[PDB]
Amino acid sequence: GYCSRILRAQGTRREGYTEFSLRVEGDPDFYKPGTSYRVTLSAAPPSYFRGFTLIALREEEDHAGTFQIIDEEETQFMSNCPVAVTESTPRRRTRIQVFWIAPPAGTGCVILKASIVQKRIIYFQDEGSLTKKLCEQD
Amino acid sequence: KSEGYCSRILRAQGTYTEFSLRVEGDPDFYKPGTSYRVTLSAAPPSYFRGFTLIALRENREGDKEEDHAGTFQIIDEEETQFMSNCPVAVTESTPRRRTRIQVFWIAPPAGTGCVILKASIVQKRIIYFQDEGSLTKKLCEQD
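^ inputs. structure came back:
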């Protein structure tokens, strides 16, 4: 896209299931328009991350719901790409969380995508454990 | 030995634009012993987290300390540092999102010959540097 290009500039592609996981609490099968979901990004022990990004896109542009910050000490909108969420400061973390408010009916499938930096290498993928797709109910 | 300092600093073989490496005053040539201000910057709305900066004798690979020329000097010790595996190279100390970093580089003695200052924004175990483009600047003796 455009934010995507910025977010991937220094990136190492690692597809599939990895020690870093993007999940939605309650493991929903689909989204309901306008519902808020708690999205989490975490490291399996003893791993951690120092930085991340998180973006939602339409299956690709950006009328893809709305993030809402839960923890201002740990996370913020990225000024470079205001629709994306990112760390407030580099520091070792094992979990971050945010709200995502599902878009209006007729939007179609949304893909939530996270990138992760632990030390120097920035990891991203198109599919796997940093990727969560949710569609409207069949 | 099989594992010297700078073993992970290499030249890309075969073949970006938002990112620029610049020497303050944009000198044509270098004067030995002078301190030059060198900045890596991202054009808005771009950013980088880590980076690696080196200065090489022209036509050298970079993977031996003896390939490197002049002396980098740290300005912001908080979040830039010398690379522990290659003490003549400069890197970030944290993966903070950045739009600019700066260092001094003291030019080498008369007779050193042309130097290529090079930055890389690609963060991998092996760091490949481009021979030309926006992340490199060549400086020869002003002579």
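Residues 11 and 61 of chain B are 6 Å apart (CA to CA). Chain B touches chain A at residues 16, 18, 45-50, 91-92, 94-97, 121-125 (CB under 8 Å).
thumbs up if we can close this ticket
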